[PDB]
Design a protein around this ligand. Structure first.
Ligand code: HEC
Ligand code: NO2
Length: 126
């Protein structure tokens, strides 16, 4: 769906912006600094699940640019493992939110954040 590589770059950066907002806005809730409303969190995690599926199709071959490292394309299999594992971590967060279970939500939130960071450390330029 991208006329030039620059359009794929703009798309995946905007998806990252929205993912950071929908993930990070739950930090005060998992810390107990803001109240826990199970329905509010269930709906927010639904939005995060949709968004978290979107970046990967915008790293098609030849779309190099932005702060993407070249290791994404020459090692297709390792990059795919990382995005699939990340989306699995999001399934655990969705199961916790759907159950209304704050203990499971805290643990799943930490695992999701670690997965964001592990990919950025390997595949995003400093
Ligand atoms: C690989 C398997 C990734 C996972 C998991 C996550 N991110 Fe990511 N992110 C990734 C790359 C390769 C890039 C660079 C894109 C480019 O072409 O520049 C990014 C970028 C971001 C950004 C910055 C967007 C911008 O302003 O330019 C943000 C804010 C971001 N990513 C957030 C984010 C969050 C919150 C994640 C998990 C919840 C997450 N990313 C996972 C690769 C990967
Ligand atoms: O949102 N980072 O792929």
């Amino acid at each position: 769906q991208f006329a030039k590589p620059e359009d794929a770059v703009k798309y995946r950066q905007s998806a990252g912006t929205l993912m950071a907002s929908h993930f990070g806005r739950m930090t005060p809730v998992v810390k107990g600094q803001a109240p826990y409303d199970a329905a509010q969190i269930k709906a927010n995690v639904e939005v995060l699940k949709t968004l978290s599926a979107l970046p990967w199709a915008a790293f098609g071959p030849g779309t190099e640019g932005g702060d993407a490292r070249p290791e994404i394309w020459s090692d297709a299999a390792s990059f795919k493992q990382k995005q699939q594992a990340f989306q699995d971590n999001i399934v655990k967060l969705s199961a916790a939110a759907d159950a209304g279970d704050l203990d499971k939500l805290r643990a799943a939130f930490g695992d999701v954040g670690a997965s964001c960071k592990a990919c950025h450390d390997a595949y995003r330029k400093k």
